[PDB]
Amino acid sequence: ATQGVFTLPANTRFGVTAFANSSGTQTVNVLVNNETAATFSGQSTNNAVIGTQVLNSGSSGKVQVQVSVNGRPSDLVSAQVILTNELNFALVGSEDGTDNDYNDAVVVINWPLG
Numbered sequence: 693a694t695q696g697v698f699t700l701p702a703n704t705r706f707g708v709t710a711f712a713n714s715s716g717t718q719t720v721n722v723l724v725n726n727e728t729a730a731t732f733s734g735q736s737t738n739n740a741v742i743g744t745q746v747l748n749s750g751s752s753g754k755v756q757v758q759v760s761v762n763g764r765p766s767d768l769v770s771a772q773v774i775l776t777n778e779l780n781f782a783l784v785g786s787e788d789g790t791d792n793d794y795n796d797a798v799v800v801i802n803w804p805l806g
């Protein structure tokens with residue numbers, strides 16, 4: 693199944709933050725309605741924040757997270773969770789190798805903001 697794709701409410705500001713846990717340099721691209729809106733890159737085996745940014749979901753609300761390492765797409769896992777019918781997390785893990793820890797880049801999207 694497709695992973696890393698989320699439909700947010702339209703025209704909503706959201707946070708996106710990426711952490712790294714891999715010897716490979718992670719590149720995280722965040723697309724809004726299929727256009728790149730943010731790109732983070734970095735390397736850590738200790739959960740360092742490689743980027744954090746506030747974006748806008750636009751008219752469609754479609755947000756996609758893509759992760760690659762040296763140009764090769766990582767395998768993604770994702771889900772969205774809503775607490776008290778208000779607080780939203782869109783969660784992504786990614787795997788660049790064979791150990792299947794799925795933490796090589798971890799991406800968290802949260803809304804609402806403010």
Ligand SMILES: *C(=O)C[C@@H]1O[C@@H](C)[C@@H](O)[C@@H](O)[C@@H]1O
Pocket residue numbers: 713714715716737787788789790791792793794796
């Ligand atoms: C390459 O070494 C594999 C890569 O980096 C490791 C340190 C570990 O985080 C592994 O999960 C990751 O796929």
Ligand SMILES: [Ca+2]
Pocket residue numbers: 714786787788789790791792793794795796
């Ligand atoms: Ca891994």
Ligand SMILES: [Ca+2]
Pocket residue numbers: 713714793794795796
């Ligand atoms: Ca890892």
Ligand SMILES: [Ca+2]
Pocket residue numbers: 805806
């Ligand atoms: Ca508040």
